[PDB]
Design a binder for this molecule. Sequence first.
Ligand SMILES: *O[C]1[C]([C]OP([O])(=O)OP([O])(=O)OP([O])(=O)O[C][C]2O[C](N3=[C]N([C])C4=C3N=C([N])[N]C4=O)[C]([O])[C]2[O])O[C](N2[C]=NC3=C2N=[C]N=C3[N])[C]1O[C]
Lengths: 621, 552, 670
Amino acid sequence: TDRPDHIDSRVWELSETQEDWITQVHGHVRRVVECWKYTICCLISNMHTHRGAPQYDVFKWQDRSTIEWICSKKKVQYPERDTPDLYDNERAVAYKVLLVSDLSDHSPTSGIYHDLAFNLEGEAEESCALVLRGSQLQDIKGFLCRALEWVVSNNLTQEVVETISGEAKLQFSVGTTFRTLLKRDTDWDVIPTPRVEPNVPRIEGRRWTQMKKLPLLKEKEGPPSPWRALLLGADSEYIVCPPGTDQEAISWIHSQSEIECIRESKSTPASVITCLTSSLQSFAEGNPVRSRIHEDIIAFGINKKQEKKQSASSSASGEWKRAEYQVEEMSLPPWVEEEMVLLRSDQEDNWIELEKNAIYTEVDGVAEGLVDKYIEIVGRTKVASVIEKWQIAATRTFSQLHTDRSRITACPIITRDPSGNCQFWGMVLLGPHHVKRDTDNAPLLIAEIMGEDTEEKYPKHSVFSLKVEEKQFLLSLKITSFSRNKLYTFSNIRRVLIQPASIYSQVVLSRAAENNSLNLEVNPEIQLYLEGAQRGMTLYQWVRMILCLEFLMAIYNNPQMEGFLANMRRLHMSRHAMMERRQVFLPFGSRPEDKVNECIINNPIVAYLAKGWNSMPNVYY
Amino acid sequence: ESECTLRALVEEYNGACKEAPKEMSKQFTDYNTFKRYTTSKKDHAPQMRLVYSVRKPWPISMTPSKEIPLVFNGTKLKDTILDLGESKRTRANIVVPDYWSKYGSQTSLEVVNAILYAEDLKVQRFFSTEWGEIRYGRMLPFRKPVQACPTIEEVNPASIPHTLLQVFCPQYTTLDSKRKAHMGAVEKLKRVMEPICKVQTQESAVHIARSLIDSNKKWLPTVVDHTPRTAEMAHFLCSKYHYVHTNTQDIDNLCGELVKRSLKCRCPKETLVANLDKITIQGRPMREVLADHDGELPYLGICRVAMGLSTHHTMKIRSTKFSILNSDHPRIERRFKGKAKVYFQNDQIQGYFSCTDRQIDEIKISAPKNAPLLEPLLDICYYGSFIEAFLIHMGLDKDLSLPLSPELNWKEPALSKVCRVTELDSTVQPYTSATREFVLGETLNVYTQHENGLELLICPTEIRSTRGPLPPGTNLSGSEFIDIYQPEGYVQTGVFEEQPRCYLVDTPDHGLSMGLSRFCVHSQGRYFQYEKKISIWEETDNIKATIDSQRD
Amino acid sequence: MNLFTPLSEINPTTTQELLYAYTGPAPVAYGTRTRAVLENIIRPYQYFYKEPNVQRALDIKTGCKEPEDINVEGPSSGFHTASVLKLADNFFRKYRPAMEKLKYWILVKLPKLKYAELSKGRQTYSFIHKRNLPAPIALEETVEFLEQNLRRKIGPTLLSYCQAIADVMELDETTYEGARTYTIKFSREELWDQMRTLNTMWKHLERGRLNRRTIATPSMLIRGFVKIVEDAAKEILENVPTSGVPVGGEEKLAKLASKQTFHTAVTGELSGDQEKFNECLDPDAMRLMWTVFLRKLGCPDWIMELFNIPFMVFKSKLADMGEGLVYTKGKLTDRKPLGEMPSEFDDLVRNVVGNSISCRLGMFMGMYNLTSTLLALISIEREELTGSHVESSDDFIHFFNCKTHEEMFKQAETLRLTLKLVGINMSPSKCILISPAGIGEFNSKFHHRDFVGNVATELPALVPNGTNPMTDLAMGLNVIKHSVNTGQMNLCTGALAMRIFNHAYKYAYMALGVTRRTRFMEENAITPLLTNQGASPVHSFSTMHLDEVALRRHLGLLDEETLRRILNPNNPVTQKGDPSMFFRIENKMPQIMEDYSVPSCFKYTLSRNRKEERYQRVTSIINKLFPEVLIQEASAPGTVRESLKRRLELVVERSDLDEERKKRILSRIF
RNA sequence: GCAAAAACA
RNA sequence: GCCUGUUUUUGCU
RNA sequence: UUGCU
RNA sequence: AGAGAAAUCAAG
Ligand SMILES: *O[C]1[C]([C]OP([O])(=O)OP([O])(=O)OP([O])(=O)O[C][C]2O[C](N3=[C]N([C])C4=C3N=C([N])[N]C4=O)[C]([O])[C]2[O])O[C](N2[C]=NC3=C2N=[C]N=C3[N])[C]1O[C]
């Protein structure tokens, strides 16, 4: 509690209601000082007896009526304002205990009773010294010295001296000018005193309406959304190369390849391939950084932001007006479900090779068994290979951004199979990248092997045909701009495996908890909706497509996706409630779909999730 | 040598007087304010530049030295050919620690043992515990505060600074500060930290020593019945799907057994129990022995409440435990008055029942499949004084969806089911926001504070207990209850900032032993001098007697 | 969404983990904050009347309105004075122990609070440099300004700091005189404007919202004043059942679970947010509530004045506008202040003061989270509401135990109308009531039969930090351990997180494939022996709490010679640039000073690419000379110089050296 | 007390 | 460029 | 200079 | 160009 160590518990309890400490300057400190005075009275009246009764009787902190009673037993009267702390029997002298900071000149406070003045460190006044005995003086000095060491330990010397002297500064005051400044923007004083009686009025409100059917999210109508992501995803492929270093693989590819443009986009001119070739040569010579030649200006937007300004100034005509930016609305593309069907096909290799942790206990063994099961049921899957490609590319591009250059940096995307053969996914070329803030955009030229081409899905990609040792491949060559923060985020994209692993582990451990045994081989039947029906699915395939969708959501994370996910949790909870025969009630102007509809603008996976929500039933009988 | 230390302390104090005119004219107490000015230590996103930092040509910054060769086997380890001599100036590759791990100077095995002692405690604590078989099931979390890690001693947080001061710098302590320290903790911590302090700085030494005696409780979900002592190994021993049973537990039981005064104190008066807590175990006063042991024992709780402290004891009948979630009125002599919801726990069995007066409104239970429910419901009925039975009071329902069978088995199929019994929905963990206001009265019954009237008793102190062994070192000399068991002091009288005409002793220890009648000690630039005690009575009994003299 | 809605094995609530796009990039704000700041300024005035009339609502000072003025079909900025008075009276009559502990705080802890606690803040607006500066720097410069304008020393207490602010507000003219050399001047009006000014900034890397929002920071002239109010509000909130903000983590979940008592015929659960918070609440309502609380306690006038200073200053707040509203003529872009050309914020032109704009209504800032929570909690105290309420700042959950559905609807409507009387305005579209309780949401925590675990909440963590291999390993392992202990991460997820963190962490410290470090190890026959060196992991799922070195030593994977090499306290890798103290227990010389290095050679410091340091030197010499300030608060008398000199003389005196040698040592002290 | 990181409002 | 409040992890003083 | 499945 | 989303980067 707040009791000081030297203050006795009984004294602290007795001082709780003696004075209203809240209304006094340093109420806690003055309570401690009053406890000091009471303890001094206790020590003075310790155990001396005169005629079978104690020599000194203490008037302090005693029921008042009893005080006048015991004082009238001796035929004595005292004023109400000033009452002596203790009274003696032999000398018949009333004594008041005073604590003072000086003893050189201490005149009697009043003629009614004499005073026992004590310093803060023990010494007493000469008359007080002669009245009392040596034992009392030593006890008081020791107690006051304990009080003084507690004071100096807590750095309360200034407050204690203030309370002892009695000046009692208000401890906070507001002047006149500051009060006038404060009261400028309010109708009340510093301490408001409204003249209205406290009352709670009765307000006629509205009625809560049942949500009898789940809200239907609106589907935006417009052109289908293109593939707007840093890399390919499903169409990502690699070229198999002999085992070696990145330089050796790049040299082999550059010396055993020919490139011919087959599809060209206005967004990415077909000339920029030259830049790639230059890098593919420079990296083949051990120099990942090369110099500009002629086509880096178009590829990386060199010397832009100034041609556009002069063009706008030449074309400027009219009067200034507010910005009113517009975001184009786009419909669900046909390639999203094809993407989801892909990313799930099996692969030859595991593509998830994480070193196993140690095993010391049985819990450790079951944990590693569960992790191994999850890895082998989601490992040989296209999502794993695409995640590895994304992580490698993001890290290789990020590692070349914590500096300022003006030349072209080449970041290869090369993985390795257990046999050791190199796997060429693509090549990232970094422009000048004079970046000053993490959210600033550095130019990039992304070449990367592609399986299938689509004009609708890749309108800004200039597809090239690449022939390497009688094998045919497709190359992307997109011009993009990307930030350090996003590149760092995608450098750790392997963390997306946690959520489907969480679902799988929850299912398996729930089944293990129903009985009292772990199987670790359970493949139960998850009941889902699919195309509006109610049909079963195996757990492994469910986890696989959950991984696919989670990856696709992670690579397409924008403000629209963030808002849509944040506001769809309420609707998901409402659906889960309605599936359990629970009624859902809403306030008067409640339209929870609008806060979700506002986030559906052009994000293809947001539209995919919205269509998935709309397909499954809205009414639960 | 001490001469080197003294000369290094000089010209560092002198060094901080020419280049810092100010910051020395300020008051010393202002150190509590400007010690927080640690600007230029800040940085942003270390994780976003770690990779690039490791792959820089010279990532590691170190003080110049000669033990690291310039070039080793064709690899240029360091970059010492620079503007050498600027403190942490030398730059070295990431492989320099790798070089040192194989080629480098070695220290004594004692140094290695001292460095790893704190971590080795945990390491061989992990391998010294036997693990039972894993049991898979749906265990509802309890979400209680539990101690983070085991400690060598139980010391209240008020005595921790004094204990550390006695361990590390006894020469700067007072006798009042000394008596507040835990002496046994001081001795064992001195033994522990004697080798450690040779390899750790003062700050690290104090941090380790305090980590060895601090409680530092944390809120975690646990199993309701098998609550672990410490949360050191709770990440694998418990979860929401599995549990692992362990048998490792332990003075707290001895300290609870030490409470025998409450037995022979019902007749004379309640004042005696508080008056007779003048005993000192070892050198630790009974005032300070408590606040070190926050156990569930009822007698220990009674003593803690008598001290003005709190207790964590929950009412416990037979094998079940009960806790009032809320109540319009407290239990009266026992039966309920008005609406009352009570959480009950008994092994894996748990739930809450709502009742009015002596009639149960309903019961909610979360129980294992095919588990008997005779004793918990019987204990609930005894608690509420409902039956004088259970089937007649609750009633019988024709619905088969209810879980409770007439035989009182969880989820047992039957032709009929007990009505107003429902599966729980995680009402567990009764929670109190404001700290409970324990009050002690006659007969030594512990009461809390309720909104309406005095709240029901928690420690009944009519229970049937044992007479187990007393804790070692108990000193009943200063008590009138010596039958439980089977030259004067110094007062201060003086505080000065300048050396008095006394004799200055090295520590509070090496004092009080030669028996001199006047001596000083030092503490934070102040000299506290003690002489003797000529008064033949203490202060606590003095105040007791003088307040007793003020009675009507 | 159909793939996220299981129907047989697990429930949809357990799949709320899947509705998280984390591990993907977080949105950032790009340009001027002026538009968002002006929307925040203009929203309070549009909501004061049922029919939006900003011009008529711009000339009001206290946002007090009649009960029929309150909007029931939309946001309603303002409050009803009588309602606040009566509700505060009811809240004080209930929860008596909370008010007793408030009185205890006022008596004991308030005089003990130091202004150095203001150093615990973050980037703070500086009224001297008109720029964001670190909180210690702002506190130091403000204290120096007060020192050299008041011609007196400020006590360490926060009350002394507040009194110094109040006193310097009285002076007609003030000067700063930094002498980094440069001198700046103020006036009462200028200093008032600087104190009432809130700097604004875009908030970056915020997830879960489509629209970027603007945050604000005040100056040190008012942070001290707000500190007392926030501390008192926290003291009250920790002792009331209906609060949710003082508790957090697992204790908050325990408090929530203690209230899930569904025993009546109708048991509903209403989980929801409160729209337009921090701008529909008038600080005068907070003043009134605090004044009622302190007046029913019996506190004197100075306490009430001190508690009323912060809200009354925020009534005169000046929100700092950004770089100006954006305008386009053709394809060009320009930034213009509010008053140059017509826009959608023309009504506020009269409130422009320099580059700052005034706003009497609202807080504009979440600077009073605890006080706003207290206001929302006093809104609940009436006989009509018999449910259980939990309110943190603007997220709330309510439990209704009603005999009939109609009574439950009446209670829900009464709750909405009370929060409107105070002016809280729960969002209708974000508030959902389930008539049989059991499924609920609070603070991103979903519960169906228990508070279900959430992954992707800890996935922003689990990335290795950049201190050193040992520190990074401790970070990762203990973060995963906390995730497992809390319940957000089970056995399989925990072990997979360990494997992912280990693999990424070993990649970061060049321990995978063929790198320069691996080549150096291989060509010099250096076996890894450690996780950061490429060795197999020693940490298991059950040993996440154990140190790598000690566990490897126990298991025999690390021999004694390698241990003696790596744990050398004299290794050059981590050698400190200055000698350090060492305690010497059981020795006649209690302290020694010598050069030191971090024991582990793998705890090095990573270099970084290329003055009030006197305070650190003073702190270091004080710590070396005064061991006891390392364990307890400093209390030695006198100035630092003289106290340190006396301590040094005492240390030399007790060194047991020869007398002439002691004199020689003492003679060098200056 | 300081520094870093994370979550939520 | 990164407010306030509440938790949590680690390390250093 | 360049190698995470 | 492009990234992108209620305004910015595409250098100074
Ligand atoms: O803030 C901080 C605190 C925390 O906790 P709380 O609860 O809040 O309080 P407490 O614990 O009770 O108190 P203490 O700690 O016992 O004491 C106080 C004093 O003393 C000092 N210190 C302490 N410690 C422990 C220490 C010190 N110093 C140094 N240098 N080191 C150490 O360690 C202080 O300052 C004061 O004056 O508490 C404290 N803490 C904790 N931890 C820590 C601290 N500090 C510092 N550091 C650390 N590490 C604080 O207060 C201020």
